[PDB]
Amino acid sequence: LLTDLYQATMALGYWRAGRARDAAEFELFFRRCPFGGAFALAAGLRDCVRFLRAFRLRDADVQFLASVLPPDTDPAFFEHLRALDCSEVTVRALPEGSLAFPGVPLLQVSGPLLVVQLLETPLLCLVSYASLVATNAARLRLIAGPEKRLLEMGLRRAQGPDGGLTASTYSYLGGFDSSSNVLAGQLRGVPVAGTLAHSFVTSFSGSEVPPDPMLAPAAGEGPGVDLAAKAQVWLEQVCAHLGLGVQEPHPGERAAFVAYALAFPRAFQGLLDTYSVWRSGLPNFLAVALALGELGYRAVGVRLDSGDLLQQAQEIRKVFRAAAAQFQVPWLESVLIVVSNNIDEEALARLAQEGSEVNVIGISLGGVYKLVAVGGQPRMKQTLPGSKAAFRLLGSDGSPLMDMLQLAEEPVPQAGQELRVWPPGAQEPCTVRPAQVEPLLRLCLQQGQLCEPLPSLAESRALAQLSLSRLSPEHRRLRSPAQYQVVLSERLQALVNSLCA
């Protein structure tokens, strides 16, 4: 994944001109207030580093490039492209989970010019996307607010060949509790749920079959029950309890329920929606819930996709008040009510509220990779020169005030106070006295060898939840938040003025 012609013409541009092995620093930051949010939260590195570690250039990829390029280029030092990197590259990176504000770096990348140049395209791919998914998952968690396991990704279908993965991965980071996706489960141990599908239900006519209809008893012992037969018997009792034709529940629906039940009898879930909740789905669920519970036992949830979810949520639990008084079955009412589809926001907020009988709810940044210094001399042209250190200044209450950029040479922190040139009011400086002064970009990789082990998602995820909880109300506002200062050291501001502002 060198993938585009300009990468290679620029590569050979630099090779031909003596600059391929020149020391360059680059920085990836962004500009857009993302979703009209104040922050991104930061994600990508996971994938970044797996990539750098399969710089994959087959001799047949390269032979091809020589086809498209001038004959005889250079002495056929295409060799360079086969020697790649190995690595003289260096990365500092915001930890995933960290909050990220416009016009502060998230990566800084350092190395041979020709190489670190190649990475513009892939690093954006990864970071921009990862961060957008996380950041949104964060805003949904903000709307829902934090209670049980409420919040369920997915149900819905890939970008691409395989990358369902990443949606899943970084929604977890943002705050969702589990996921339908099994790639993310296997790799990264996202919790996996989400079992139900309309396409199962509608594949059944009615015409049930006994290759084996018999459900083993929950306990142990030979003969169980012809589970199908019994559920009919329970269906009489329910329709009686409900004022219904026994003729009325769709027997397709019943078969599929039964069919699910034989395979997952400890985890029997019920999709209420396919035809009619009230006159089909629900009666059939109970018929079948209650046939279990003698033998294979204790059903486990139901699902809705349409209508006023909140009104059906609330009516569904309702009269179990007497729909389990009537049959005496302790557990029915504490069955889970899962809802999905047409949710987005408010329903979202009120289904996360009130007294709501729902338990589980299914479901641009301006990213920029810029050279800031080559040959340890700075480089400028609205984006700031030279190789920088970055630092979040926090208030007494825990919450960030402002990020501060300064030179790599400079001394560092502390918890006494600073002059400091804000980039609006850039006529004279503040003095500011921060409670804490935590640095931002940590060393991920030096000379191609990792300088840190990689967090679990659960670490990364906890850091996010932490960072958001500590972030100011005014900066967490979904629309029209307060601004957030980035601001400059004196010696930076002076380099900016040196390099004719």
**Of 105, 96, 104, nearest to 44 (Cα)?**
96
Task: Out of 213, 395, 429, 448, name the contact with a second copy by CB under 8 A.
Answer: 395
Please identify, among the stretches 194-202, 232-240, 276-284, 407-415, the one whose residues bind a second copy according to the rule CB under 8 A.
407-415
Q: Which two tokens stand for residue 310?
A: 């909140």
Contact between residue 288 and residue 282 where contact means Cβ atoms under 8 Å apart: no
Burial zone of 59 (CB within 10 Å; 0-12 exposed, 13-18 middle, 19+ buried): exposed
What span, in angstroms and rounded, lies between the C-alpha atoms of 421 and 210? 79
- Do residues 348 and 144 make contact, with C-beta atoms less than 8 angstroms apart? yes
218 part of the interface to a second copy, by CB under 8 A: yes
329, 426, 432, 495: which one contacts a second copy (CB under 8 A)? 329
Among 186, 396, 483, 498, binds a second copy (CB under 8 A): 396
The residue count for binding a second copy (CB under 8 A) is 42
Q: Could you report how far apart the first and last alpha carbons of the chain are, in Å?
A: 37
Residue 264 interacts with a second copy (CB under 8 A)?
no
Q: Identify residues 271-290 at the interface with a second copy (CB under 8 A).
A: none
Between CA 136 and CA 142 the distance in angstroms is 10
Residue 118 in contact with residue 21, Cβ under 8 Å? no
- Of the residues 143, 242, 426, 450, which one makes contact with a second copy according to CB under 8 A: 450
Among 257, 313, 301, 249, smallest CA distance to 275 is for 249
Residue 147 binds a second copy, judged by CB under 8 A: no
Q: Which of 59, 346, 354, 452 binds a second copy (CB under 8 A)?
A: 452
> CA 165, CA 182: separation in Å to the nearest integer?
8
Q: How far is the CB of 333 from a second copy (least distance, A)?
A: 8
Between the CA of residue 489 and those of 94, 161, 357, 436, what are the distances in Å? 20, 46, 53, 17
Interface with a second copy, residue 409, by CB under 8 A: no
Determine if 446 is a binding residue for a second copy (CB under 8 A): yes
- Least CB distance from residue 58 to a second copy, whole Å? 30
Nearest to a second copy of 13, 395 (CB atom): 395
Q: Does 497 bind a second copy (CB under 8 A)?
A: no
d(CA 22, CA 373): 11
220 binds a second copy (CB under 8 A): yes
Name the segment binding a second copy (CB under 8 A); options: 157-165, 215-223, 367-375, 485-493. 215-223
By CB under 8 A, tell whether 328 contacts a second copy. Answer: yes
Question: What is the Cα 175 distance to its own chain's centre?
Answer: 8
Q: Which of 487, 462, 465, 491 is nearest to 476 (CA)?
A: 465
Among 222, 223, 245, 424, binds a second copy (CB under 8 A): 222
Report phi then psi at 270, rounded to 5. -140, 115
Ligand-binding annotation for 470, yes or no, is no
Chain CA centroid to CA 447, Å? 30
Choosing from 13, 185, 213, 217, the residue that interacts with a second copy (CB under 8 A) is 217
Nearest residue (CB) to a second copy, 278 versus 331: 331
Site residues for a second copy per CB under 8 A: 217-222, 296-297, 320-322, 324-325, 328-331, 333, 394-398, 411-415, 435-436, 442-443, 446, 449-453, 459, 462, 466, 470
Residue positions in the annotated binding site for nicotinate?
Answer: 6, 195, 303
